[PDB]
């Protein structure tokens, strides 16, 4: 019984662990809505870093992973950027953090 439930590993927007330099290439044109997920914010509840464009600049708005999962609006159970992004871009980014309301509506990927 091969139960092949592939929710999220490599979305056409998602990265995981990168720098500013490939955030320079993806956050080039933009001023709003541009997710990717870099490193450089790893300590308390959150390893990788949902860097979002705000008025021309790459602002690191890091995920609530806790140990390694996904769930910001959820009690640490969502487990997929693809559904932790469907629910968030079609609603509000004041459900994640109420200091911004954009809603991840312009992410990039190289070409």
CA–CA dist 110, 101 (Å, integer) = 26
Q: What was the elucidation method?
A: NMR
CA–CA dist 59, 30 (Å, integer) = 12
CATH of the domain at 27: 3.30.505.10
Alpha-helix runs per DSSP H in the chain: 21-26, 83-89
CA–CA dist 78, 7 (Å, integer) = 10
| Domain encompassing residue 3 | 1-111
User: 49, 37 in Cβ contact below 8 A?
Assistant: yes
Total tally of structural domains belonging to the chain:
1
Q: What is the DSSP string of 39-107?
A: SS--SSS-SSB-EEEETTEEEE-----TTT---TTTTS----TTHHHHHHHTT-STTT-SS----S---
CA–CA dist 18, 48 (Å, integer) = 9
CA–CA dist 31, 37 (Å, integer) = 17
């Amino acid at each position: 019984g091969m139960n092949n439930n592939m929710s999220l590993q490599d979305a056409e927007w998602y990265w995981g662990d990168i720098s500013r330099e490939e955030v320079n290439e993806k956050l080039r044109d933009t001023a709003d809505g541009t997710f990717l997920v870099r490193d450089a914010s790893t300590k308390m509840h959150g390893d990788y870093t949902l860097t979002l464009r705000k008025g021309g600049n790459n602002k690191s708005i890091k995920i609530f992973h806790r140990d390694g999962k996904y769930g910001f609006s959820d009690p640490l159970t969502f487990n997929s950027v693809v559904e932790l992004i469907n629910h968030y871009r079609n609603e509000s980014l004041a459900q994640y953090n109420p200091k911004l309301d954009v809603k991840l509506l312009y992410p990039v990927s190289k070409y």
